[PDB]
Amino acid sequence: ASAPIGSAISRNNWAVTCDSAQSGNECNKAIDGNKDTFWHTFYGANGDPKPPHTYTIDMKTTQNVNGLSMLPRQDGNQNGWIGRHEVYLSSDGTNWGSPVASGSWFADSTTKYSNFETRPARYVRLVAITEANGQPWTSIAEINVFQASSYTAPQPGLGRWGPTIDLPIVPAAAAIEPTSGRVLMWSSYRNDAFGGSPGGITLTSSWDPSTGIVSDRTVTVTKHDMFCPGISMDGNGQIVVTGGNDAKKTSLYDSSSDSWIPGPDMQVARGYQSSATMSDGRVFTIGGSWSGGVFEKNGEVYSPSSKTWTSLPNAKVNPMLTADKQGLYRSDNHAWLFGWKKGSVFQAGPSTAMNWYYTSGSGDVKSAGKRQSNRGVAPDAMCGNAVMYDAVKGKILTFGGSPDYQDSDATTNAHIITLGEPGTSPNTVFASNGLYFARTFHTSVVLPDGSTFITGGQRRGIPFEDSTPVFTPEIYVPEQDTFYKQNPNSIVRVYHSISLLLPDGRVFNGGGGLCGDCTTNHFDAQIFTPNYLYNSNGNLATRPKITRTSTQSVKVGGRITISTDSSISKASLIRYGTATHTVNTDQRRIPLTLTNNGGNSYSFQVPSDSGVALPGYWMLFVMNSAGVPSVASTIRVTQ
Numbered sequence: 298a299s300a301p302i303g304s305a306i307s308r309n310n311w312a313v314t315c316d317s318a319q320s321g322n323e324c325n326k327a328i329d330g331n332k333d334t335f336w337h338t339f340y341g342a343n344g345d346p347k348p349p350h351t352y353t354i355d356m357k358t359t360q361n362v363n364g365l366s367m368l369p370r371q372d373g374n375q376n377g378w379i380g381r382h383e384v385y386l387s388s389d390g391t392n393w394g395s396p397v398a399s400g401s402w403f404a405d406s407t408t409k410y411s412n413f414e415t416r417p418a419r420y421v422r423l424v425a426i427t428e429a430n431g432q433p434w435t436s437i438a439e440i441n442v443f444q445a446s447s448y449t450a451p452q453p454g455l456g457r458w459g460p461t462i463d464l465p466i467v468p469a470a471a472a473i474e475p476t477s478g479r480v481l482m483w484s485s486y487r488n489d490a491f492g493g494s495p496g497g498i499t500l501t502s503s504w505d506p507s508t509g510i511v512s513d514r515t516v517t518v519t520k521h522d523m524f525c526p527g528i529s530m531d532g533n534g535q536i537v538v539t540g541g542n543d544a545k546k547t548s549l550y551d552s553s554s555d556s557w558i559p560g561p562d563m564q565v566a567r568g569y570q571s572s573a574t575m576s577d578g579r580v581f582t583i584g585g586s587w588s589g590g591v592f593e594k595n596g597e598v599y600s601p602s603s604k605t606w607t608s609l610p611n612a613k614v615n616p617m618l619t620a621d622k623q624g625l626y627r628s629d630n631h632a633w634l635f636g637w638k639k640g641s642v643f644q645a646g647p648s649t650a651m652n653w654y655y656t657s658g659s660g661d662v663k664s665a666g667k668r669q670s671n672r673g674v675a676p677d678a679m680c681g682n683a684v685m686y687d688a689v690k691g692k693i694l695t696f697g698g699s700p701d702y703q704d705s706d707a708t709t710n711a712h713i714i715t716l717g718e719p720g721t722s723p724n725t726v727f728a729s730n731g732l733y734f735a736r737t738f739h740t741s742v743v744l745p746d747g748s749t750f751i752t753g754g755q756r757r758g759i760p761f762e763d764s765t766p767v768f769t770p771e772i773y774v775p776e777q778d779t780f781y782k783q784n785p786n787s788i789v790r791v792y793h794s795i796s797l798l799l800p801d802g803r804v805f806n807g808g809g810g811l812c813g814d815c816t817t818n819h820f821d822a823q824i825f826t827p828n829y830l831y832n833s834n835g836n837l838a839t840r841p842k843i844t845r846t847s848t849q850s851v852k853v854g855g856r857i858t859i860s861t862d863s864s865i866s867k868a869s870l871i872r873y874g875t876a877t878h879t880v881n882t883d884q885r886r887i888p889l890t891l892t893n894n895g896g897n898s899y900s901f902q903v904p905s906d907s908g909v910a911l912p913g914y915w916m917l918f919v920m921n922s923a924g925v926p927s928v929a930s931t932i933r934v935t936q
């Protein structure tokens with residue numbers, strides 16, 4: 298199931314209008330409080346007008362609207378199930394602006410929701426752009442509009458949430474498809490559940506920021522239910538998805554061809570493991586006792602060139618285990634892994650003990666000391682986040698999490714870890730005064746300016762329960778060693794939520810739940826627009842444009858020359874991200890040293906060390922004097 302975020306508005310005095318309505322299936326049948334009566338567009342009768350079809354509601358007075366629900370006909374007939382759709386709000390009834398929510402609802406008879414940030418409005422319009430099975434009709438048994446207890450305008454300067462993207466699945470895992478700019482998402486064998494899976498199948502969905510279209514695809518060719526997986530983008534530009542519901546499987550997603558390809562089985566069956574792309578484009582993984590058995594699961598490594606996994610039994614998981622009260626089942630999960638120099642992988646947590654993993658020979662592991670600071674030794678931080686916001690300087694920001702996977706209080710702990718050479722114990726200090734809000738199951742992304750956006754989570758980890766939620770995201774600004782609260786959102790994003798950086802410089806945050814009949818499934822995402830995209834007016838700022846790039850594929854140590862439509866102050870490369878269960882081992886940021894050629898022509902060198910400039914796809918962002926980023930230019934980095 299799912300749920301509205303607001304309270305149902307009384308429909309007593311509502312006036313409604315439809316684009317068409319069969320007799321017996323009048324427009325007002327959608328607001329009569331009877332689940333057995335529904336509005337239905339023209340059929341047979343006045344023919345079969347194809348969608349879009351439109352439901353417009355005049356609520357007579359201004360409401361602080363924060364959602365709608367749509368109950369499909371309940372008579373066993375699928376005709377008119379709304380697929381693609383948009384929700385508009387209005388204060389006058391003629392000026393509708395842009396949708397507050399849009400996307401696609403799953404093809405079934407369950408109540409569908411559009412949950413979105415509160416906005417005062419008197420009119421609400423639902424546009425059914427397509428029918429879920431591609432037929433001409435739209436039908437609705439009951440439509441409801443929901444309200445918040447109050448409205449508060451977003452504070453100027455603190456970003457903006459919206460719109461909502463409605464989805465057919467709970468996006469518990471996600472990745473950007475770097476060649477197409479689409480967001481790829483997946484759940485499990487079902488749109489809303491993983492339990493009872495027979496394995497072998499994954500429901501996926503994608504959203505295209507350029508068209509606003511949400512599509513779906515069932516993946517069976519890889520014989521892999523990809524819930525609870527490792528995820529890495531390898532050096533050959535493919536997303537390596539490992540284990541989970543099918544604990545020994547590897548599936549490969551190729552962005553260029555938009556296809557899934559079977560990969561080799563891993564040597565050890567795993568679930569909830571982290572994997573990390575390495576300096577040579579290979580992928581390392583370790584731990585993962587959520588599935589495939591509970592025992593010591595030491596490292597192994599994937600080669601995109603030979604298409605094999607090779608066990609690294611001496612890359613021992615033991616030193617990275619947390620002291621989780623549930624034992625090994627949890628304690629080897631979700632390692633904070635980062636590919637680093639010379640095939641090494643740094644493990645920054647969640648265990649108090651940090652470690653170097655080495656991938657030569659049959660592998661090795663070396664203590665990198667305890668995550669700590671003058672405030673003391675950091676405790677285990679399961680489902681804390683870790684983000685490498687300046688790979689050139691080896692800077693990792695870690696934050697949040699709890700000593701145990703669940704039933705454990707999260708903390709505000711945050712550290713800056715500074716990597717040097719593999720095998721040296723990195724310096725660690727506390728980050729500012731820590732998070733504003735203690736959170737676990739939160740998610741995070743590094744933004745083009747090197748700040749880290751941190752969102753969602755709850756104060757006490759209770760999977761599938763929307764309790765103690767944190768609605769106010771925070772951004773860490775490294776140059777200031779300061780966290781800043783941003784404008785809060787209205788949708789709980791706890792266990793099984795994701796965030797990713799979009800090519801346009803906005804953040805895509807979604808998911809949460811995946812518990813079947815629970816009411817805590819969130820079939821959606823929202824966009825967060827950082828303040829760097831807004832002018833002091835409150836309007837979207839003019840963005841510098843990259844009018845020319847010398848090349849779209851570059852070797853590490855290689856030069857790129859660009860032209861812009863205006864003077865550039867700073868530039869960064871942000872490696873494309875992948876996300877699930879708080880883990881994102883693919884994102885990282887390289888601040889770029891620009892040479893000004895004059896005439897708004899600039900050049901820069903990609904770092905020569907592929908442990909820093911991990912091979913794969915990266916976004917190039919340029920920022921003007923005002924600090925406004927361009928949209929990303931996609932660059933492939935190779936060795």
Ligand SMILES: [Cu+2]
Pocket residue numbers: 525793878
């Ligand atoms: Cu899970």
Ligand SMILES: [Cu+2]
Pocket residue numbers: 631679680738878879
């Ligand atoms: Cu977690």
Ligand SMILES: [Cu+2]
Pocket residue numbers: 630631679680681878879
């Ligand atoms: Cu975790």
